[PDB]
From a paper:
To protect themselves from host attack, numerous jumbo bacteriophages establish a phage nucleus—a micron-scale, proteinaceous structure encompassing the replicating phage DNA. Bacteriophage and host proteins associated with replication and transcription are concentrated inside the phage nucleus while other phage and host proteins are excluded, including CRISPR-Cas and restriction endonuclease host defense systems. We further show that Gp53, the PhuN family member from bacteriophage ϕPA3, readily assembles into large 2D lattices in vitro.
In order to compensate for the high degree of beam-induced motion and lower image quality resulting from increased sample thickness in our tilted samples, data were collected at a high frame rate and processed using a tilt-optimized version of MotionCor222. Alignment of the p2 asymmetric subunit models using the acetyltransferase-like domain results in an RMSD of ~2 Å for all Cα and 0.77 Å for the core Cα. The bulk of the differences between the structured domains of asymmetric subunits appears to arise from small shifts in helices as well as interconnecting loops. This suggests that the N-terminal residues are necessary for the formation of the core tetramer and further assembly.
Numbering used by the authors:
A (entry chain E): 591 to 602
B (entry chain A): 19 to 275, 288 to 555
C (entry chain B): 205 to 275, 288 to 403
D (entry chain C): 19 to 204
The structure:
């Protein structure tokens, strides 16, 4: 139902 | 207590690290050196061990690390390689499920999705700084992946290739942070060059960076842009390929309040550039995705559903479709009286004419640095940023104008499919690895041999997402033991989503509209 | 740095019948291992992301007996002898402050009469050396006390201590110029 | 592919290519080190790889390289060692011959003289420059040679001598470039 977000990088 | 790490780590070194992270470091350092000796790898970088003992993770990992200073900022790009250890159990998480008025808790092991928390990453960054000396560095996430406990560590070839691929990606991300120029149709659009493409009805699986099989019914091959009459590049031999997309088509049994009952669910399972190209960027990915669209837009995917006539062991034989149809029976497809015309009729009555395009999304896959933007684009705190990155990537391909087809803020690029994906493989009668996804709708109908009640119990498990996913995962595993066999190994899980039809319209039309014409090789069926 | 608002300490006295080993694998005698742990309130903890342990430090003590005849007091005066001082394996540093904090673990081994458990008999041993029944040779009995058998009671044990062992031990320690703590022990 | 390779070869590396060429690079590296240890050769030269999957080559080669700055010009001197492989098929020339009144075609595999074209040389120039970092250097062709497909790589003596001789030829060409005084009857 919800979207968790990990520590992505470069694009943001 | 956890704040005593500020004292614990102030000075000195210790004797520690798990047996797999120890062995993994030793083989990876060996491989680095051989790659340098053979001149395949450049000697500009470091490999590091991240310990569960020395620092704050549940699972140890090796870190593929490269660095450069970019416009005064120290930048490090890291691609973690998780090392699960079969002898080490991390305390489980409590999954409390509110089943209406009944509350029950299931305890379960943390998978790489649960392990790779935001703090897990932040701890990886801190350890690297301790190991590189770059205490003020910024660290780029190239996407964690995992090298599973199960197999023997002696496969130097694969391990070498993992380092090679991981450093490739690290160089890309330093470059793209450095402002490197994007992939575009303009680079392909020689004034004397054109594209062409075909659908491969493979008869075989394709394999990820660790050698595990990936389901594909159709491999779409986009030919190298070129033209007869161009200057030949000396005495050369090459495959005329630019890129490819791996996909499969299921037949989902879907609701209706006149359409037939099954949906042609076209699923992308992998996106690859031709092997001669080294870089992996969003523009390259996005351009290749147009390969799946053409599967149903210009050509007809339904050929992939033909039964393997003459082969007794076809677990996904189309004849099974008769169990969901009004026949409530397997269609006799073993017989000399079964024709192409009869096949088409089964589909006329059972399968909807309008294709649906969706794809897997895997934060831990071979393309994780990129998969992550497409995943965050599904929803969450940074959806707007992920979407902005994706639309920018297509505009880089076409020179602007994606926005002339649709509003990305009214039409988010990828929607959730809800039911997520359990990945794994099973062994066949000769011991080969096959994708567990084979028990799809036709697969499951044959597995139960027409027992529709058994099929529907399974089918509801794979569709009703009001049911907590742990409950669904347990029943999915129960069904594999009964129908697939006990020789089943589970691997890293993944998300699925639906590509917005307007994203698709804009990508395909925008490329065609700027003149990068592609011919179909299968000019007529 | 230890006084967390969500953190307190607690300790356990271990009476197990096994030795410790030093830095080159040689045995160390002790009767009691005093283990001091960090206890946190069950809210958010750093360990939500990792396997974790609460050991802070440990002091290993031996319980001795000094014979002090009076030509009255029970003839044997016990002592708590520190045979080793260690920090938890999590802490790489070894300093004076850490050593001193850990020493408070020996002090607490004498809470109540816990330290005297080291003087008990233990299971099934036909002829073995730390048997309290040997104490009967210095006491009026001039004989070994039948302590290893099914006819020896808890009450008889308590009586051997009441008459032969003084209830309050002397604290002392062994300082090794060449041990791993030598930088500190030499002070 | 060439329009893309400009930038998408820059980021990342791969494995692959002819195993015989990899063996040849490895035996030369071994011999190089033995020669340094025994003081037969100075550790002042580099050996690079020229390979199929990167350069679309026809035949693979090892490249022996020396460098000097001569009157301000950075100069790279090299001697390629071409490596044919009996297990690898090479594309042929289609030779149309007017045999009297009728044209017939004979196909033949390109030989080392057909493969080592001016452009092959230009790609050697560029490949070495990228591996040495001297992107604006002038490159001297010291005269290539060949290590034929047919035979055991077990003749370390021959391979050692080829390396020594290649190094010497490279030095003579730099010496010419720098104005070294000629041999004369004087």
């Amino acid at each position: 139902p919800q979207f968790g977000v990990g520590q992505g990088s470069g694009f943001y | 207590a956890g704040n005593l790490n500020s004292i614990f780590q102030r000075s000195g070194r210790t004797d520690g690290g798990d047996a797999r992270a120890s062995e993994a470091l030793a083989v990876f350092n060996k491989l680095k050196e051989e790659a340098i000796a053979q001149q395949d790898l450049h000697d500009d970088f470091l490999v590091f061990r991240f310990d569960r003992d020395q620092n704050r993770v549940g699972y140890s990992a090796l870190l593929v690390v490269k660095r450069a200073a970019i416009n005064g900022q120290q930048v490090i790009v890291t691609r973690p390689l998780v090392m699960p250890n079969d002898q080490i159990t991390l305390p489980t998480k409590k999954l409390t499920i509110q089943n209406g008025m009944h509350q029950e808790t299931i305890e379960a092991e943390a998978d790489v999705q649960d392990v790779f928390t935001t703090q897990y990453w932040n701890r990886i960054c801190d350890s690297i700084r301790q190991q590189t000396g770059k205490h003020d560095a910024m660290v780029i996430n190239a996407g964690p992946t995992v090298i599973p406990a199960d197999f023997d560590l002696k496969d130097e070839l694969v391990l070498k290739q993992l380092l090679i691929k991981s450093v490739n990606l690290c160089d890309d991300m330093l470059a793209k942070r450095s402002g490197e120029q994007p992939f575009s149709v303009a680079m392909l659009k020689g004034t004397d060059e054109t594209l062409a493409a075909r659908l491969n009805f493979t008869g075989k699986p394709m394999h990820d960076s660790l050698g595990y099989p990936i389901r594909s019914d159709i491999l779409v091959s986009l030919n190298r842009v070129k033209k007869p009459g161009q200057q030949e590049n000396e005495f050369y031999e090459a495959e005329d390929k630019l890129n490819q997309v791996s996909c499969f088509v299921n037949l989902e049994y879907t609701p209706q309040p006149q359409l037939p009952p099954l949906t042609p669910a076209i699923v992308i399972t992998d996106v690859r550039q031709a092997e001669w190209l080294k870089a992996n960027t969003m523009e390259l990915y996005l351009f290749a995705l147009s390969n799946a669209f053409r599967v149903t837009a210009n050509q007809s995917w339904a050929r992939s559903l033909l039964p393997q006539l003459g082969k007794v062991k076809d677990m996904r034989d189309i004849g099974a479709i008769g169990y969901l149809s009004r026949l409530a029976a397997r269609v006799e497809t073993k017989t000399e009286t079964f024709t192409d015309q009869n096949f088409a009729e089964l589909l006329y009555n059972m399968v909807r004419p309008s294709p649906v395009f969706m794809s897997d999304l895997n934060r831990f896959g071979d393309n994780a640095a990129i998969e992550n933007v497409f995943i965050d684009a599904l929803g969450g705190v940074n959806q707007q940023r992920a979407v902005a990155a994706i639309i920018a990537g297509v505009n880089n391909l076409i020179g602007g104008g994606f926005e002339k087809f649709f509003d990305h803020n009214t039409m988010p690029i990828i929607q959730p499919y809800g039911t997520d994906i359990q990945l794994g493989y099973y062994l066949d009668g000769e011991g080969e690895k096959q994708d567990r996804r084979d028990l799809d709708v036709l697969g499951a109908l044959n597995a139960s041999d027409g027992n529709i009640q058994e099929w529907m119990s399974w089918y509801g498990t794979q569709c009703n997402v009001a049911v907590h996913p742990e409950l669904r995962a347990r029943q999915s595993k129960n069904f594999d033991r009964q129908y697939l066999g006990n020789s089943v190994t589970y691997t890293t899980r993944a998300h699925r989503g639906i590509w917005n039809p307007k994203f698709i319209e804009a990508l395909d039309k925008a490329i065609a509209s700027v003149g990068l014409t592609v011919a179909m090789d299968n000019v007529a069926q």
